[PDB]
Amino acid sequence: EIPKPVAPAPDILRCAYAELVVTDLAKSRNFYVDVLGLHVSYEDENQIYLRSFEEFIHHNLVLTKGPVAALKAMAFRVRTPEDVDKAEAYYQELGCRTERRKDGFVKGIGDALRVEDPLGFPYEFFFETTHVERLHMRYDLYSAGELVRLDHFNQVTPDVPRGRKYLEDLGFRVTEDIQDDEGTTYAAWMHRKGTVHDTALTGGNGPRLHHVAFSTHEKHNIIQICDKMGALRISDRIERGPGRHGVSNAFYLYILDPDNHRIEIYTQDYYTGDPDNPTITWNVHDNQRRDWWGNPVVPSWYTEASKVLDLDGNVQEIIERTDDSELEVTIGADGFSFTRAGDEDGSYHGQASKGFKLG
Amino acid sequence: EIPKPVAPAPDILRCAYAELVVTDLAKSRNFYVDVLGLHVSYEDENQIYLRSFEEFIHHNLVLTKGPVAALKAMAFRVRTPEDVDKAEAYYQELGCRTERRKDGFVKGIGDALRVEDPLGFPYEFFFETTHVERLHMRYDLYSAGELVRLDHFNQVTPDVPRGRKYLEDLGFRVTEDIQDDEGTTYAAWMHRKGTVHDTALTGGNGPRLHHVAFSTHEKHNIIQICDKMGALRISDRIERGPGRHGVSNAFYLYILDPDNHRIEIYTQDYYTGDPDNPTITWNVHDNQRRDWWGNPVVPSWYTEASKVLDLDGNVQEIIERTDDSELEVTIGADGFSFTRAGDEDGSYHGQASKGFKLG
Amino acid sequence: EIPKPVAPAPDILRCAYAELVVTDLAKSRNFYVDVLGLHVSYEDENQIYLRSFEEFIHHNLVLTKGPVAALKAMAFRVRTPEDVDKAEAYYQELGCRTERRKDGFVKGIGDALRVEDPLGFPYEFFFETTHVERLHMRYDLYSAGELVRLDHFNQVTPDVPRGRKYLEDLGFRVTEDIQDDEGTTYAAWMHRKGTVHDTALTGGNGPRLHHVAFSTHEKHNIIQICDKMGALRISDRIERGPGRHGVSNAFYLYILDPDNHRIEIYTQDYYTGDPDNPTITWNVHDNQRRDWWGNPVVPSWYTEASKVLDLDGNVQEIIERTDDSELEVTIGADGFSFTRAGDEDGSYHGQASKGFKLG
Amino acid sequence: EIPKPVAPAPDILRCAYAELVVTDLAKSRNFYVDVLGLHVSYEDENQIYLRSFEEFIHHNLVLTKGPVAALKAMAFRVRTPEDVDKAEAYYQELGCRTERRKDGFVKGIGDALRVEDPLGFPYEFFFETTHVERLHMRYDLYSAGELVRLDHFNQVTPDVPRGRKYLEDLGFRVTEDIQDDEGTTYAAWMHRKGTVHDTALTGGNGPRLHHVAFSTHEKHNIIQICDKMGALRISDRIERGPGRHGVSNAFYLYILDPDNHRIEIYTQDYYTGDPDNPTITWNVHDNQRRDWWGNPVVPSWYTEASKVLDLDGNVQEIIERTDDSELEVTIGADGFSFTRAGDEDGSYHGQASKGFKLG
Numbered sequence A, B, C, D: 001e002i003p004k005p006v007a008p009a010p011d012i013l014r015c016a017y018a019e020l021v022v023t024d025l026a027k028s029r030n031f032y033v034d035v036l037g038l039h040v041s042y043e044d045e046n047q048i049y050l051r052s053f054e055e056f057i058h059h060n061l062v063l064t065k066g067p068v069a070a071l072k073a074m075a076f077r078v079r080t081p082e083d084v085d086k087a088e089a090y091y092q093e094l095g096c097r098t099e100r101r102k103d104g105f106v107k108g109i110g111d112a113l114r115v116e117d118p119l120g121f122p123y124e125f126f127f128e129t130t131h132v133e134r135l136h137m138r139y140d141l142y143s144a145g146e147l148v149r150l151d152h153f154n155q156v157t158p159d160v161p162r163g164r165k166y167l168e169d170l171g172f173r174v175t176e177d178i179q180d181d182e183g184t185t186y187a188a189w190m191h192r193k194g195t196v197h198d199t200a201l202t203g204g205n206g207p208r209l210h211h212v213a214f215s216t217h218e219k220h221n222i223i224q225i226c227d228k229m230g231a232l233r234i235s236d237r238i239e240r241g242p243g244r245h246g247v248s249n250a251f252y253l254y255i256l257d258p259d260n261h262r263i264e265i266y267t268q269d270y271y272t273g274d275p276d277n278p279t280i281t282w283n284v285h286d287n288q289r290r291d292w293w294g295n296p297v298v299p300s301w302y303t304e305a306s307k308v309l310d311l312d313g314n315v316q317e318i319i320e321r322t323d324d325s326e327l328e329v330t331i332g333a334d335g336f337s338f339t340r341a342g343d344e345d346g347s348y349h350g351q352a353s354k355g356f357k358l359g
């Protein structure tokens, strides 16, 4: 569907920051800085610029006050200045709306391209950025739940193979995926920096942003987040987890900000930088693929995701998935999942694992 | 009401071991030894004797081959040889059936008393025991999921207040409980050794044994047990967890052995040895009381538990609870739970937390 | 030989708090509160009262402004009010000075007895204390190096067997000790609460206070204290560690406060509550006894310790040890230590392990 | 002084494996397999092939029986089969001895080029390697001390700047170095894979191999290695640590194999893949540069290192450093180090930190 341009792909380094529209800047500030302990690079009455403990670029998260909570841009750092020109020609050849600012769209970023990409997502490409104090040895500042890096984004899109091919052309390498025996793809993970992923597609009504993911050093740092959320009596904002993922093998947690933007806390996946890095495909009915301990996937995880904006700041039209639903085929009334393939013991039919059905 | 005897209670030091009857010895061995890493002190075609990493007494668990899987004895060590006589007098005055074996009921234990207690539970009291090599610095043997001590038992009984009074008289001090505003007690925790408990009472049809708990050093050790069960493709034997308890504050996991005896893995509760240790009462509707992160309590946790035997080796008849059911008042069709008292937001009506209903 | 009184010992529960005299109260506040994260129960111009994360009694540590930095009192909590009576009668029979104050010596303590004990140490015994908010679930307050309990004191005294027998009559049970093949005892560890110790004797010139130890939950919380002191550029106040102890098997770290009072951080020793708990004796020349990894023991650890005060607030006269010196016999010019008993390989003559002499 | 070739550099992915010659195969196997838990990919009477938990290529270490313990090859994987031709051309232009084997030098490596590089080190470049089962989710085989990846090499060489420029032409990017005000360089670290390093240069008599480094997931894994070595009564084989590095910010430990080959265990350094990644220069006298906590650097760490072999299997002649010795300027009789720059308090003159002097 999406052809490969003749123009060369920009050389993408890694996911770098997201810009999220939030409704109430103070309430968001409490969440990101007071609960989560992210580091303020800059803030005013309109925006809060936040970085992780080990980051030296200006920010990993920008929160912008607005009327409608949404993703405004997912940004990728490119290797050279010229790569911003290479990105522009690329998305031009594709027929996508693009916007170039030599001065950047946000503080702490220089020359940048924003695009409405083929999947309806607002991507940013940029090289130039304001270096700040790298806080990686500032143990006087370290919190028990310290967020040390931006790791990845996850995008909800109807047709996964279509998006996958397009990301592949752009230079992302696919590391794992979820399929069924009848040829349906439910999800795919792909990378540039040599971790399991820098972004990922999740099958579903799209464009929507599923989540943004930050890394911690150790599993006990993720346990601390949960513990702190209990003490602040906000455990209702813990959406799902903690657990160990099947796909990626990372220890994980999903939480929800004031505007229901989903944040993932993530640690200890594996190295993927070799070009013949072996791929891993999971069957959708495998009850260890998402939570390795067989714990049930929370139904909100499959249905809820953030709005995304176009370049005029307007919410993008959602298109409905027509391929089968992961929720439905695993935990819905006609779904099933298994612990050992072909074994009736430890399998679930028409309900989730651990004795639950959908609420 | 169980009367306080005139006879002095045995000075109980701690929970010491449990004797569990199992149907297939070889399968059971694979779980406790090969999966969980417990250390064999003795075995034959009929029994397996197992101790934790820091134990010096002969064993913490005895698996005994039998035709019906059940708790045969929950054993407590007492401070002196003389306390065994005390225990016999005490139980006789209560009108209970007792049996005394000067050379013990199981290997590695000397003079012992077993009783059918007023709650219908098979308790043992002993002092004499064969000292073995204490493995506390045998780091050459240390597993990534190493089980380091026996921590507690947990008992299902229909009338908690009644059992509580009897256990206080016996010298246990209640450290935490769960109650509602209408007079109902759903569970109680009680100790001798200065941790949160040596046993506890869980409201339900009983006598049934709810679980036996072992401790790890660190939270990562419990994570590894989950990870290993995932690798062995027996995640369906993970019943509930891992999580942070409210009551007790401990990190925890619950897993099911081949006869569905429930085992808890536990770490990092607090010191309770001062005689005026503050008692903590939780409301039964508080959705952070069992799992602090608010994850739903799996239904089987409330409905399933092991049979217990009398002194003749027959299963004790089960007496139904008539008091309110914790399951029903919190996660049942007319149930209710809350995150913040008096707040509707993050409350649950007629269902479980995180988007689930009972399957 | 200190005689055994006819009067019964008081029932001691555990070590409870220390009172340290400090010379600059602001400078000390910065260390114990800002660096270490101790929680303030009460403060004014003259005194700071601090508790650990899991404590429900008023405080574990009192910092008292004064002219000469010293130990003012090491306090042990007793099981009942009448144990303070037993304590007074006990020490009086011993011929020791006593002072009783019905309203206590520091805020938050009630009826209290302080004594100049047979070894020159200021011991306190009390029962009454003001209960405070137990912060054990206050994870919104939890530091990456959080101190969770008061664990023990360690005293320096010239004649270890003499002190040992006195502490034994007083109800403490020896757990581990250090001796040589010539009859000399160098150190002894003894307890009431069922951990390795509540106090301990280190041979040397005394009465002096070697240290006060606080516990953490996990090994990484001790690592963080080190990492924080690095980031505050006060690494010169890390005296020794971190490491794994041979004796006690605890993970450990020694640091120095503004007045050189030594503080230990400690986690994960083993259960000692059974009366036949197997005692362990190490040879003084075993290079794994103090640090299990063989790392050398810093000479200041052997030579430096705090002054103690008598009941009139004057520094106790120091009596010189004549028994052999641990320092000299192990790491001095004619000292010796071994890795494997009998083996010349991995032994050290006239120097420290790992390639070092003493400066 | 090493000129840049006109021939394009091979595209280097990462350090891949080391081949070490050992004198007693059986004893070396005990150390690497039974003590350290590395995984066998192939073994016979002459050689052991070992890999780390997360590796998919054939091996990360080859132990080769032979007369003199030494490094035989340090191998880097390249991007494409063609990069092997490029490396041959590159080194031929340098005037270095080369040897090309189309079916490789060791099992499970295909087309390979070995060389005697300008510093005298036997480098290998390959692309082709036999894929093996990636053990990253094999938690049934995970050890409490698990080694999860090969992270880096560290080479000892007399002229750090000379070596630095040659590695830079070869595509390695410098991340951190150690220098003094007089203009001497003592040490430099350089990468390809996006971590602090794939190889490093330590100033000293060379060519020697300083160490081979493996990563763990968490800091506790490294503490387990030290605990297990105390239990095996081989703590004398613990050379240095465990510690937090200043350079790299990684938690670390140095141990010694039966042939005195040094192994580093290492975790949690930071991301370096952006092309403008800030370089960090430390002053040689800063006592927090090597151990962040101020612990002394063991002198053997500076003086001892492994012989390396030329292409005929003969040991390479060692050239003496004429630049200043890091040992002598920091811990030698004329050296010094500081905690805070310019502050004499926490400074050390003519000795090491923590009250120690050179052995």
Ligand SMILES: O=C(O)C(=O)/C=C\C(=C/O)[N+](=O)[O-]
Residues within 6 Å of the ligand: C154, C200, C213, C245, C246, C247, C248, C250, C264, C266, C289, C290, C291
């Ligand atoms: O004595 C302590 O300090 C302690 O906590 C336990 C043991 C100890 C030294 O102090 N040790 O070196 O083994």
Ligand SMILES: O=C1C=CC([N+](=O)[O-])=C[C@]1(O)OO
Residues within 6 Å of the ligand: A152, A153, A154, A200, A213, A245, A246, A247, A248, A250, A264, A266, A289, A290, A291
């Ligand atoms: O981070 C992730 C990796 C694995 C995964 N999953 O559920 O296994 C989902 C996930 O959230 O996708 O981005």
Ligand SMILES: O=C1C=CC([N+](=O)[O-])=C[C@]1(O)OO
Residues within 6 Å of the ligand: B152, B153, B154, B197, B200, B213, B245, B246, B247, B248, B250, B264, B266, B289, B290, B291
């Ligand atoms: O270990 C326990 C402590 C707390 C608890 N719970 O679910 O809170 C249950 C529990 O399992 O009872 O013994």
Ligand SMILES: O=C1C=CC([N+](=O)[O-])=C[C@H]1O
Residues within 6 Å of the ligand: D154, D213, D245, D246, D247, D248, D250, D264, D266, D289, D290, D291
């Ligand atoms: O790997 C490292 C990192 C830093 C370092 N150092 O002494 O700081 C030495 C090495 O062996």
Ligand SMILES: [Ca+2]
Residues within 6 Å of the ligand: B180, B181, B182
């Ligand atoms: Ca009610």
Ligand SMILES: [Fe+2]
Residues within 6 Å of the ligand: A152, A153, A154, A211, A213, A264
């Ligand atoms: Fe994710």
Ligand SMILES: [Fe+2]
Residues within 6 Å of the ligand: B152, B153, B154, B211, B213, B264
């Ligand atoms: Fe329990």
Ligand SMILES: [Fe+2]
Residues within 6 Å of the ligand: C152, C153, C154, C211, C213, C264
């Ligand atoms: Fe101590």
Ligand SMILES: [Fe+2]
Residues within 6 Å of the ligand: D152, D153, D154, D211, D213, D264
């Ligand atoms: Fe290194």
